[PDB]
C-alpha cells in the first residue's frame, strides 16, 4: 500500500528514469592497461579509459565521478546558445505545434546545472535565460489546449516527461466525468 499518490509518478521517480540514458564524458583516470575492474550488471564495459579521450557511460555513474572530480560532463547537442535560438523562433511562427524537445527536456537541465557548472560556455544569462524562456512559451499552448477537450480523443504530439506528470490528475479526473455524462445519456 503506497497510499501517498498511488496513481502517478512522484517527481523523485522521474529523476530515476532519466538517469538510465547514456552521455559522453572526458575522463581523468585511465585504468586501461599497459602491455579491481568495474563488473556491474547493466553496463559491464568501459573498464578501458584513457585520460582525455571521450567514452559513453550511463548517467548515474557519471554523477558519482563528478563528486570526486574524476570526470567532466560534456554538454549535449541542445545546451548551445546557437541551437536553442532556432527552437524558440520555431515556436512563435507556429502557434499550434510543439517545436521539438529531446524528451529529457527539463530533467537534464537540472542535474547538469547544479552539479556540472564548469563545462559549458557561460551559463550566466545565456542558458538559464533561454530555458526559462522556453518553458513560458510552451506553457501558454498547454493552457490554450484545454479549452478544446472532448470525450473521445485528444492529441498532444510532442510533450516532455515532466510537463505530463504535473498534468495527469487534472485531465483524467475531468475527462472521466465527461465520459459518464455522454454515455449515461444513452
Amino acid at each position: 500500500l503506497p497510499a501517498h499518490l498511488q496513481q502517478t509518478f512522484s517527481p523523485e521517480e522521474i529523476q530515476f528514469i532519466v538517469e538510465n540514458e547514456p552521455i559522453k564524458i572526458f575522463p581523468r583516470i585511465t585504468t586501461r592497461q599497459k602491455i579491481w575492474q568495474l563488473i556491474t550488471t547493466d553496463d559491464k564495459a568501459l573498464n578501458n579509459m584513457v585520460a582525455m579521450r571521450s567514452t559513453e557511460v550511463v548517467l548515474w555513474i557519471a554523477l558519482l565521478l563528478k563528486q570526486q572530480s574524476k570526470c567532466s560532463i560534456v554538454a549535449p547537442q541542445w545546451l548551445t546558445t546557437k541551437e536553442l535560438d532556432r527552437k524558440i523562433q520555431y515556436e512563435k511562427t507556429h502557434p499550434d505545434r510543439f517545436s521539438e524537445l529531446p524528451w529529457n527536456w527539463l530533467v537534464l537541465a537540472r542535474i547538469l546545472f547544479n552539479k556540472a557548472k564548469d563545462d559549458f560556455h557561460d551559463p550566466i544569462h545565456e542558458l538559464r535565460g533561454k530555458i526559462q524562456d522556453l518553458r513560458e512559451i510552451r506553457q501558454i499552448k498547454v493552457l490554450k489546449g484545454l479549452k478544446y477537450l472532448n470525450e473521445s480523443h485528444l492529441q498532444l504530439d510532442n510533450l516532455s516527461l515532466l510537463e505530463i506528470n504535473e498534468l495527469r490528475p487534472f485531465i483524467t479526473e475531468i475527462m472521466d466525468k465527461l465520459r459518464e455524462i455522454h454515455t449515461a445519456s444513452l
Binding site: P2, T40, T41, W60
Partner: protein, 59 residues
C-alpha cells in the same frame, strides 16, 4: 486492471541478485588503494533493489 505477471524472467533476477551479493562480500572481505569500484557495485545493487521493492508492493 491487473496485468499478467512476468513469471519467467523474474526467476532469473532473484537468482542474479543473491549471486552477486555474495561476490561483494567475497571481494570486500577477500581484499584485506581502489575504493572506487567497490562503491559502484554497492550503489547499483541498491538501485536494482528499489525497482523490485516498488513493483511487488504495487500489485
Amino acid at each position: 486492471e491487473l496485468l499478467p505477471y512476468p513469471h519467467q524472467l523474474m526467476k532469473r533476477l532473484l537468482n542474479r541478485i543473491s549471486m552477486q551479493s555474495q561476490l561483494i562480500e567475497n571481494i570486500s572481505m577477500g581484499f584485506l588503494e581502489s575504493k572506487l569500484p567497490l562503491l559502484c557495485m554497492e550503489t547499483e545493487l541498491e538501485r536494482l533493489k528499489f525497482v523490485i521493492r516498488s513493483y511487488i508492493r504495487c500489485r
